[PDB]
Amino acid sequence: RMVMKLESDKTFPIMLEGKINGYACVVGGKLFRPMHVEGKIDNDVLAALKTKKASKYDLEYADVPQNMRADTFKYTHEKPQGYYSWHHGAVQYENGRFTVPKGVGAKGDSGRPILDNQGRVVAIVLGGVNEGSRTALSVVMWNEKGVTVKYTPENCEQW
Amino acid sequence: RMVMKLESDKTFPIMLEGKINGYACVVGGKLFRPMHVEGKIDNDVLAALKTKKASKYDLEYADVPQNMRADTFKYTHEKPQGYYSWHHGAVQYENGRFTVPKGVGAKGDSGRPILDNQGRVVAIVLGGVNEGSRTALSVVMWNEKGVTVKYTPENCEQW
């Protein structure tokens, strides 16, 4: 069940001195890479792309080539309450916030697209923090009008 | 199998160089053929029929004689999401765009009509651009007001 959402080769790792510190994901014909993650994408064709920064929303976007547009994630403007699928495990949406079990998400777990129960991306998580006894994720989603609203919990911890 | 048996003889190839280079279709009482196809219609009565140029929409349209108005394709203004019948195979309408699997469609296939599962024409193609694993189509369809919106992807290869 949960294993039917990890066969997505369209995600790409970021290499820094042979180590992993982040993931660059392609959605809707555009490649998104977290800004705070330093390194180079393993794929040469995507690495050669020149990206335009966006400091406020904390990610850089680039336009993928025509031949790569076919195999790409699909975004969703609706985020119904409740269950969601992620590579690390289940995630749960309550009151506009994504939450995960304890210890899920750490150094090198940013840029991960949070898939839906249908099998298409609804948002991209850039970091998570655990306040009190609950863990929340800083994540950028997409509104119905397409304004790319970002929700970030207070005192957010990177990655 | 299910997509190929939807065969209609209303389409007519255009003959020049003694080879097939495109198809012209009679829809709703009008004969449509693209710019890029040269030659005469196989049907002599339509071959001798005068055509009016519409270069910016890329289709010559001709008024069919009143006798032949009885047997013609039925135009459609609604485009529900999902797969549609075609001469070759299923064509997916997604995100307001018609797409076909890899390799399907090449030169000499321009002008063929995309129908629906009901059995009536919903659009007609003029060219196709290969986006990778899935190929997008340059196609013109019909709206509820009959404004004839034309969808032409970027740098589309002309069939």
């Binding site: - | 307001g96 709206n143 007001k145 404004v147 919106v149």
Partner: protein, 48 residues
């Protein structure tokens, strides 16, 4: 006993004809451009 200019003896009525013909030349062009822009916007709005 004086000095003349190139526009000295045009007189008001010749000014009227020259302005109406040249101004009317520009007015119809402006109308054409306005109509072209309006129909271009209308066509772009017709795109679904």
């Amino acid at each position: 006993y004086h000095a003349q200019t190139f526009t000295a003896a045009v007189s008001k009525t010749a000014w009227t004809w020259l302005t109406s013909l040249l101004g009317g030349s520009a007015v119809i062009i402006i109308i054409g451009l306005v109509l072209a822009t309006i129909v271009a916007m209308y066509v772009l709005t017709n795109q679904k």
